[PDB]
Every structure is written in C-alpha cells, then in structure tokens.
Amino acid sequence: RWRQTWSGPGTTKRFPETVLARCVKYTEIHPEMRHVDCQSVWDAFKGAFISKHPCDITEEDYQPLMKLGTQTVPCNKILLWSRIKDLAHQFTQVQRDMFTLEDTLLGYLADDLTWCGEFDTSKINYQSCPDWRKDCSNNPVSVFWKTVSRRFAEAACDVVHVMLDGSRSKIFDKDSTFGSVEVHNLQPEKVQTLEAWVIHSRDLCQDPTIKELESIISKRNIQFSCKNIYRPDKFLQCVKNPEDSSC
C-alpha cells in the first residue's frame, strides 16, 4: 500500500485495450498482415504471462504469440540499434530506407510498454513489476525482448547496419541486448558485413569498445565496417533532401 512488491513500475494503464488497438492499427496499415486476427493475438500475448510467476517466464511461454506474429522482413534492409532509439526511428520514417524491430508487428505492439501478472491469479499487476537488475532477469518484459530480438537477428542477410550512441561511456556494450543477443545470432552463412554508425570531434571508430566489437564479429567470419556521424541533425536533413549543398 505504501510499499510495493517489486522495484519496477507497474503495468501500463489500459494494457489490454492498448495492445489490441495497436494490433488493429498495424494490420490496417501493412497489407501482408491484413488477415491477422487481433483478438487471438491478444489471447496469445495474455497467455504468456497471466497466472504465471513474473520471475519464472521462459521463451516457450511466448511461442504461441511468436507463431501468430510471424512476418517476412526484407532481409538485406535491417537496422539494429543500441541506446539510440529516437534517431533510428526518425531515420526509418523518412522513406523506409531500412527496418528496425519496432517496424515489425510484435515490436510495434510492445514498444514503450510494461507488463506483468501474478502466480495463481489471473489479474494484471498495475502496481509494480520485477526490475531486471534488482529483482529478476526472467520477467515478462525482458524475456519478450530477448525472444523477438533473437529471431529478428536470425532473419538478417547481406549488409546489416547498427546505430550506436557515441556519447555513452561504452559505445559498444557487451551487456546490452545488441551485444549479448543480436551479435551472436547473426548467421555467418548469410551475413556478409556488419556496419556500425557511431552517432556523435574524435574518431570514435578507434574507441576501445569498437575495437572489441570488430574483433568479436571478425572471429565469427563476418566483415566489420564503421563510420562516424558527427552531426546527426545534418545527416537526417540529407536523408530527407539528398539534394543539398551541405550533403
């Protein structure tokens, strides 16, 4: 009452209604998902975490949802990112030069939301949810993202791009979802090159954590490439209008 069970913020208000509406909106826009039944998608989502202990969630819990959300993405146009979501989304919005995970049905449904249930009750917990660090890593949100990020990385081919935040302490972070899940699930048989865009001065492509990334991916038999983006404001402007003196 004046203290909560878990350390993290509770489930987003109107969670059920929100997921359902996002599904409707997504399926009206994208024609190849125009057949999906959103009620059953919701049912599948619910079934992954309702009445389950929010610290004992597994990837199998989410397989019904994964099956319903199966989607073909252009394998050579994938954009990954770490800790730099705003720029990555503004970029893909211009002319769909690339696809991020949130441009998929499943990524779109869950983006920016929090959720969890309770053991031996079918109630949603609007009070609090497990914190990944203080409480447990096997919570419904962390497990959802690990499962979908894995499959998304497995679908990539040819040249794969990643946006990284050059202002952070660790530009490449081995403990992030990109560093711990996506880099290890790219398929060397299909992926020719990983190219990083370091968003800002110095040559950050010489930064020690970037040399670590290069070494990791080279040892997987994948080529590594890196570019500095010194002025992200100018860069976005060039994407919208490559017809510019500055560009």
Ligand SMILES: N=c1c2ncn3c2ncn1[C@@H]1C[C@H](COP(=O)(O)OP(=O)(O)OC[C@H]2O[C@@H]3[C@H](O)[C@@H]2O)[C@@H](O)[C@H]1O
């Ligand atoms: N889009 C997305 C996402 N949205 C929320 N979370 C997440 N994790 C991963 N991704 C995808 C994976 C990668 C990397 O995303 P990252 O920034 O490196 O992840 P982090 O470690 O900083 O997230 C902390 C916390 O937030 C969620 C995670 O589950 C975590 O619990 C992107 O390309 C994207 O496709």
